Amino acid sequence: SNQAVKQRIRAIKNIGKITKAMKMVAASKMKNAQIAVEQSRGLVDPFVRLFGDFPAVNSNKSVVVAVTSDKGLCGGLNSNITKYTRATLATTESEGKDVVVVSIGDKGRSQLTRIESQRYQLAIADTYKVRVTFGQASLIVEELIKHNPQSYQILFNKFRSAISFKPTVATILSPDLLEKQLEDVTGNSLDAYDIEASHERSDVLRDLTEFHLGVTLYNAMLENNCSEHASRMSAMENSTKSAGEMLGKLTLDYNRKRQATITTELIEIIAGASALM
Amino acid sequence: MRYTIMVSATASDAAPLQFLAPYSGCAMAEYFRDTGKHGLIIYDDLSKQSVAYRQMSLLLRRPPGREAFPGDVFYLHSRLLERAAKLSKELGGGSLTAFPVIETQAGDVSAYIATNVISITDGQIFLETELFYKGIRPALN
Amino acid sequence: MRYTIMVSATASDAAPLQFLAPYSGCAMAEYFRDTGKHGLIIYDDLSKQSVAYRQMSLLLRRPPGREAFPG
Amino acid sequence: SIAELGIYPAVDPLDSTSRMLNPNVIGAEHYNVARGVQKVLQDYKNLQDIIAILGMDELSEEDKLTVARARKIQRFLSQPFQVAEVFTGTPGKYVDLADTISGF
Amino acid sequence: EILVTGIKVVDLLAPYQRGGKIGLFGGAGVGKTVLIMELINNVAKAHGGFSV
Amino acid sequence: ALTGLTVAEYFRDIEGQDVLLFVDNIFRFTQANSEVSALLGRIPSAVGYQPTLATDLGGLQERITTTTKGSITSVQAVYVPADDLTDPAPATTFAHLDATTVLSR
Amino acid sequence: ALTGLTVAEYFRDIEGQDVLLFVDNIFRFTQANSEVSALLGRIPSAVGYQPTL
Ligand SMILES: Nc1ncnc2c1ncn2[C@@H]1O[C@H](COP(=O)(O)OP(=O)(O)O)[C@@H](O)[C@H]1O
Ligand SMILES: [Mg+2]
């Protein structure tokens, strides 16, 4: 009885420091990863400056990649972009296109199969174990090249600040299948460029689309990893605050039970002493 | 003070005087209740009257109960607060309104005397300290 | 019922009767124990026997102990 | 703890019992829906500490389904009373037994 | 035999017996006089016999 | 503590001064009166204090006031037992206090 | 317990050999002294025990 709350105080008092240690670990990880996000943000600009940004294309085959977390104490990150995925899979699909759903992170393979069980075809995980390199995102992009869609959709949280993480849909148009077709505006928007490659414009667009997909995927899983660390930092301080308030209420009840125990034992001793005297 | 009576059994006064002072005040206000007029009474800190009565009972070698209070600490306050009545037209139509004050310890509404007087009085004006140190005064919960 | 005895000192009965009902039931079942048969004695609410025994002892002025129970 | 949540009458459904809650007395579907409501509420009570610490966004899908159904049946067990309409203003509701069995 | 009260939690999870002892537990303003007034208002008018 | 009050009551009532009275550890005044109450066979109240707890504290703390001759101002060190502000000795001592001056490490 | 101890103390003191004394539930010694000590005229100690624990 009176050691039940005395041990519960120990359990919640240790959780109130485990969650604060995890908050400081997430904060140091976000500090170390923000400088990598800000360096990687630059290379995404020339591809959306050259190839534009066309999310609402009439693709026939599309691949949607939802960049989620591995560990699940992020606090509403991997479930929010699943809302954006079901709001995006229900936006492009209006005409009978084939959709592949891919997820990076274990909390994506645990949650995209919930609402989308049959169009899901690939699960990448353990991406964030040591660090994210460009060769890793290149291999993930090559496994997205094993399928041959007409567009690529990337769902990830963009690390704007430590409080705001805007979910971002990023679109990569497949080269001769759709990329030339979206630029055919009374002629073309790509004819102004003099292709100084070894082979034709179709192959330089194939290589440019693969490189743009690799860069978008690398930046997506760096943005999502840093916003994951910021979300874990902000969700291990709601837990330290709640474990502090629960520890306060348990300490108040323990003091009440402590005083009641001393009064009860004292009353028992007095009644036993007055039964004789 | 032209309308106020002030009955004071302070901290240095003897515990039977702190025990009896709510009853003295309630009689002085029952004068106005019983003759058609209207009365207000504030028994400020009945939680200290119950401590005075606990002192009186434990010095009479009476067996203590929950939180070392006597068994008739409910009767102590229900005998008092049931006199705050609104009388019928045949007895005058007079009224007496009580405002007993109870001090809790850490927001512990479920104390012995607090749950005694909550189950005697009609309403309740619970004043919270978390609203009070946030500047919201009167800190009505 | 053709195999069961029902000893029942209920709440309205005196505290000596509720104190003695488990021993009376065990004495009734010791007929089947002592003569080669098998008994199943079920003392429902042995805590209520303890409460009745505490009452019967506190009124006999025996000094109480922990939780006002006798020694 | 249930009155401070605004639920009225503040009955603890996991501590209020009866001897009539028996399928040989009240019928099989009444007993089944009563025990199902009680199991949903007990499974919600088992998650209150982990809802408080880790938050609502860290549960499983069956966990955040049964928490939502439990929060629906917690409010649905409350009811405006006909004698309590003089200090609340909402009118009272006499529910039939078939209505509440089917509704739960 | 059951006693229908018109209260949802009472009729569902702890149904009252027509001719049985019923208790309403709770302390200091949780509503056990409003609940007994509602039980009077619901049961005693649809009873026929006498009340005390 | 009553002897300290008497020496200060001379300076207030005769000399007409503003006196400081440092009752060091008022909780030890409480626990000494608890001990003399237990030695006199009185039944102890809640957590273990004397049944006259508020009255002994009031008989101390009600002589420390402003008269029309002078004033006694008491700076009392307060010990809070088992880190409990709801314990009856500090919760009775806190009823008389007008200010708290918290020295922290 | 005193009886079993005396049987062991004869083997230890008179015959001078190594004895093994197994006492199952020595708590029952203090419990049994507490059961009579209230009727022996002793006002009770702490959590329910005798003053001579
Ligand atoms: N069914 C209800 N609806 C709304 N308020 C209620 C209800 N039941 C109780 N209350 C609240 O509880 C207060 C008093 O409860 P009460 O019946 O007096 O409990 P008790 O008799 O245990 O003191 C009422 O003023 C009311 O505000
Ligand atoms: Mg009532």
Q: A263 and A231 share a domain?
A: no
Helix, strand or coil, per DSSP, at residue A35: helix
> For residue A268, what are its two tokens?
């028992």
The reply, when asked if residue E5 is annotated as ligand binding, is no
Token pair 């860069």 is found at A215
**Which residues constitute the domain of residue A125?**
25-235
> For residue B53, what are its two tokens?
């009565």
Q: A86 and A211 share a domain?
A: yes
256-275 of A, contacting C, C-beta below 8 A: 268, 271-272, 275
Helix, strand or coil, per DSSP, at residue B44: coil
Q: A41 and A108 share a domain?
A: yes
Specify whether the CB–CB gap between B128 and B107 falls below 8 A: yes
For chain A, what is the domain count? 2
The technique by which this structure was obtained is cryo-EM
Q: Which residues contact D32 (CB under 8 A, 6 or more apart)?
A: D23
CATH number at residue A263: 1.10.287.80
- Partners of A1 on chain C (C-beta within 8 Å) are none
CATH T-level fold of D21-104: 1.10.1140
Which letter does DSSP use for residue A155 in this model?
A: E
Largest pairwise CA distance in chain C: 44
List B96's β-bridge partners, or say none: B39
List E16's β-bridge partners, or say none: E3
Q: A67 and A37 share a domain?
A: yes
Chains G and F touch (3+ CB pairs under 8 A): no
In terms of phi and psi (left: phi > 0; alpha: psi -120 to 50; beta: otherwise), the region of C40 is: beta
Q: A110 and A188 share a domain?
A: yes
Q: A245 and A187 share a domain?
A: no
Closest chain C CA to residue A266: C66
Q: A251 and A119 share a domain?
A: no
Element (H, E) at A92: helix A80-92
Q: A276 and A165 share a domain?
A: no
Element (H, E) at A165: strand A165-173
Nearest atom within ligand 1 for CA of residue E36: 17
> For residue F98, what are its two tokens?
């007008």
Q: Is E28 on the interface with B (CB under 8 A)?
A: yes
> For residue A178, what are its two tokens?
């759709």
CA distance F64 to F96: 10
Q: A275 and A202 share a domain?
A: no
Mutate to test the interface with F, among A6, A257, A262, A276 (most CBs of F within 10 A): A262
CA distance D85 to B61: 49
CA distance A40 to A220: 10
3-62 of F, contacting B, C-beta below 8 A: 42-46, 51-55, 57-59, 61-62
Residue A126, Cβ density class (10 Å: 0-12 exposed, 13-18 middle, ≥19 buried) = exposed
Q: A194 and A265 share a domain?
A: no
CA distance A27 to A229: 7
Q: A88 and A169 share a domain?
A: yes
Peptide bond into B138 cis (omega under 30): yes
Ion ligand 2 neighbours, Cβ < 5 Å: E 33
> For residue D18, what are its two tokens?
């009866």
Residue A142 phi/psi, 5-degree rounding, is: -70, -35
Q: How far apart are the first and last CA of chain C?
A: 38
Residue E33 CA, ligand 2 centroid: distance in Å: 5
DSSP letters spanning E23-50: -----SSSSTTHHHHHHIIIIITTT-S-
> For residue A110, what are its two tokens?
């645990």
If one counts every other C-beta atom within 10 angstroms of the C-beta of residue A222, the result is: 25
Q: Is the CB of E41 under 6 A from ligand 1?
A: no
Q: Which residues contact B79 (CB under 8 A, 6 or more apart)?
A: none
CA distance B92 to B85: 12
Q: A114 and A148 share a domain?
A: yes
Output the CA torsion D51→D52→D53→D54 (10° steps).
30
- Within 13 A of A117's CA, how many CA atoms are on the CB side? 1
Neighboring chains of G (3 or more beta-carbon pairs < 8 A)? A, C
Q: Which amino acid is at A83?
A: K
Token pair 């029309």 is found at F68
CA distance D25 to chain E (A): 7
Q: Which runs of consecutive H residues, i.e. helices, occur in chain G?
A: 2-13, 27-37
Output the CA torsion A123→A129→A131→A137 (10° steps).
-10
Residue F17 phi/psi, 5-degree rounding, is: -115, 180
